[PDB]
């Protein structure tokens, strides 16, 4: 009676209490103090209220399961519809509205039609923080902001991940490739699954480009989910000396203006020899030139370095595969890899000429 | 897109259950037919507290102020502080944080700053001794409300450090198919910026009402001296009844004001407590909301808790209607099979809740 009254939701709650016989106010409703005084002058109404480990865990969970059964043994449309509903092995029809045309048009019964129920978390989007790994049999290394198709829960979706490292647990700063044989972190805009769920990732899902190699590229688990990530990409500012004394030097071009040097005063720099230093004051007439002080006398063949950190953003890109809405259901094509784009529009790969290593030979070091 | 509610009732419970469930809601007609219509300042600052606690949740107040749009986000916690207004004490803002408190990335270390007590709200001793043990046996183990200083109304000036530091996955399934035997009955009588004899007058009034029941009565006494007393005179009394074999508790509090006799207030809170014992069964009339909220966000099992006839009310069933309105779950009230009293046993099958914000 009372449950039907509670969940019959076209009648007022005081009408439920009336035909059975507001929460900003925290403390509940009491009588008048005089009525309560004459009511509780007596006391006798409430005087009777006053006065192995593995098998143990399995026993606790089977105790909960028998509690589940013996409390399910109740009203038939209560159990079998609304208090739990359709346990397992129930044969159901399930109707979806606004299913696309292409499914019904191109429905080929070879390809299975699987459906899975999303949790409250898995309908949310945002940055998923994983730790992943180039799969040991995938040949080529992976690159940040190259798409790969993830299989994260029920969904398969192509995303743009960016591989990070917490370099001795200080930053979470941005790599440019995945490592060769171990795990890195990663962050991709996608549907937020729960933490500790595993996933695969694939470069190429089609069959025209299926090649001869191994097709699954990345493996990993999900570490954390969030709405925002704060990851950084190191930028150094390089400048050269042009007037050197003992223990101090005038540094030429890492800044364009004395306002910029004023913005950066007191910062610690270093040469490539590891000589630590500090910038002290902007010089007046040559504009980006400043005066720095070092540990000792630096040389004219050095480069000073201001290690700073620039924030980088994940790219909010997400397309699910929708392979069953195609006329071929293989041959799904998404965003291409960067080498594929360069091969398509014939751009040469970017080569900084002074980034290439050489064979340095030391001259012998003699002093006066 | 939005689950729609009407009126400014149960406002904190609606925003709290929307944050738990992750469902976008609208609350329409916030006192629209009124002389100063719209949201009030204390519930606007509660929205600011929700934006402090969560991250990525967008709240969208209208022009007229009479409808709010809450699209929730991830509970992240962190350390914060909240300078809540004089319209409501710190209990009005620390009560709805005890639901969101164990389900965040980083542990709750917030300190609220304002009035400590009110007639129609939760106190420090209320929050602590009543509402922390039901969480303590629903699954959390490290939760603490500290008073650094307390401020009686109207000027207040008291700070309260809510720290929860057990980030559980989900609350356990409750099984309370008994009425817990009350082992002791204790309490705390506090007074700030007044004479220390008022506390003993309150204690003597409460215990002369309590003296005829054959249990053991113990009321602790604190006067607050110095900067810890706050900016205003005040005094109040909070009794709990303590079932020690399981840990259950039933509380009742109030505060005195300008013209109030302390023996009168002590005996009033004592009789109000005994009536809560009468109208209580394994919970209190005010511990019952978050008890059944933790039962409904437990595991995907059946959890059952005994309640009595008089705990059913318009507040309790409007709570149940809001629960079913947000995440589509029903309670099943089965009666006990013995007939010297009218007690139901509410079985709730909890939704499949986990906290997905805590990093693994």
């Amino acid at each position: 009676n009372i449950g039907k009254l509670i969940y019959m939701d076209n009648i007022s709650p005081e009408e439920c209490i009336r035909r059975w016989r507001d929460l900003e106010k925290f403390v509940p409703y009491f009588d008048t103090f005089e009525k309560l005084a004459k009511k509780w002058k007596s006391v006798d109404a409430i005087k009777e209220r006053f006065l192995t480990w593995y098998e143990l865990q399995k026993a606790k969970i089977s105790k909960q399961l028998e509690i589940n059964n013996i409390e399910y043994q109740e009203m038939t449309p209560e159990q079998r519809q609304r208090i739990e509903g359709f346990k397992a092995g129930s044969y159901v029809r399930i109707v979806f509205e606004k299913v696309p045309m292409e499914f019904v048009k191109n429905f080929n019964p070879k390809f299975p039609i699987v459906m899975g129920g999303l949790l409250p978390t898995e309908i949310k989007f945002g940055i998923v923080k994983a730790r992943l790994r180039r799969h040991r049999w995938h040949k080529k290394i992976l690159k940040t902001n190259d798409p790969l198709v993830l299989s994260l829960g029920w969904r398969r979706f192509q995303t743009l991940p960016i591989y990070t490292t917490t370099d001795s647990r200080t930053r979470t700063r941005m790599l440019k490739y995945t490592p060769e044989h171990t795990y890195c972190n990663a962050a991709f805009y996608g549907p937020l699954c729960s933490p500790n769920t595993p996933f695969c990732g694939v470069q190429i899902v089609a069959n025209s480009d299926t090649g001869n190699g191994f097709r699954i590229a990345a493996t990993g688990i999900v570490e954390e989910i969030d709405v925002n990530i704060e990851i950084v990409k190191k930028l150094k500012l390089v400048g050269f000396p042009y007037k050197i004394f003992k223990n101090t030097a005038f540094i030429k071009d890492m800044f364009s203006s004395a306002m910029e040097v004023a913005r950066f005063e007191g910062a610690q720099i270093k040469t490539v020899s590891g000589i630590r230093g500090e910038i002290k004051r902007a010089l007046s007439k040559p504009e980006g030139h400043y005066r720095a002080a070092f540990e000792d006398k630096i040389l004219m063949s050095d480069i000073v370095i201001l290690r700073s950190w620039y924030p980088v953003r994940v790219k909010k890109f997400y397309n699910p595969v929708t392979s069953l809405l195609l006329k071929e259901k293989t041959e799904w094509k998404g965003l291409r890899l960067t080498g594929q784009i360069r091969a398509a529009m014939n751009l040469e790969t970017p080569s900084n000429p002074d980034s290439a290593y050489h064979k340095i030979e030391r001259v012998e070091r003699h002093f006066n | 897109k939005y689950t729609t509610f009407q009126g400014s009732q149960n406002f904190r419970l609606r925003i709290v259950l929307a944050t738990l469930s992750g469902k976008p809601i609208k609350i329409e007609k916030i006192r629209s037919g009124d002389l100063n219509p719209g949201l009030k300042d204390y519930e606007v600052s509660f929205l600011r507290l929700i934006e402090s606690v969560t991250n990525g949740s967008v709240i969208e107040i209208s022009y007229t102020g009479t409808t709010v749009i809450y699209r929730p986000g991830i509970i992240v916690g962190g350390a914060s502080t909240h300078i809540c207004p004089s319209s409501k004490p710190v209990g009005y803002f620390v009560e709805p944080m005890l639901y969101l408190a164990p389900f965040s990335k980083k542990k709750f270390s917030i300190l609220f700053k304002g009035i400590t007590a009110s007639h129609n709200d939760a106190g420090i001793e209320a929050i602590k001794w009543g509402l922390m043990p039901v969480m303590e046996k629903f699954g959390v183990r490290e939760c603490a409300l500290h008073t650094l200083k307390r401020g009686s109304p109207p000027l207040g000036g008291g700070e309260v450090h809510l720290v929860v530091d057990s980030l559980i996955a989900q609350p356990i399934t409750m099984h309370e198919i008994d009425r817990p035997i009350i082992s002791s009955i204790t309490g705390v009588a506090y007074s700030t910026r007044v004479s220390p004899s008022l506390v003993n007058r309150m204690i003597d009034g409460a215990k002369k009402v309590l003296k005829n029941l054959q249990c053991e009565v113990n009321i602790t006494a604190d006067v607050w001296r110095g900067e810890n007393s706050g900016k205003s005179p005040g005094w109040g009394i909070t009794l709990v009844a303590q079932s020690k074999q399981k840990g259950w508790s039933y509380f009742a509090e109030d505060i005195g004001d300008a013209g109030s006799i302390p023996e009168e207030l002590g005996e009033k809170v004592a009789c109000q407590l005994l009536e809560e014992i009468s109208k209580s069964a394994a919970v209190g009339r005010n511990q019952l909301p978050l008890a059944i909220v933790y039962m409904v966000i437990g595991k995907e099992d059946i959890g059952r808790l005994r309640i009595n006839k008089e705990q059913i009310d318009e507040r309790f069933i409007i709570l149940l209607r809001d629960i079913k309105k947000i995440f589509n779950t029903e309670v099943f009230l089965k009666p006990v099979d013995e007939a010297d009293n009218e007690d139901m046993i509410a079985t709730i099958k909890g939704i499949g809740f986990t906290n997905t914000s805590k990093k693994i």
Binding site: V227, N228, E230 | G38, V44, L47, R48, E51, T54, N55, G56, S57, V58, I59, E60, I61, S62, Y63, T64, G65, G73
Partner: peptide, 14 residues
């Protein structure tokens, strides 16, 4: 420092 890693905000149109 309070703004630095937020993503929400109340939208007070009053």
């Amino acid at each position: 420092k309070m703004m630095k890693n937020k993503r929400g905000g109340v939208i007070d149109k009053r």
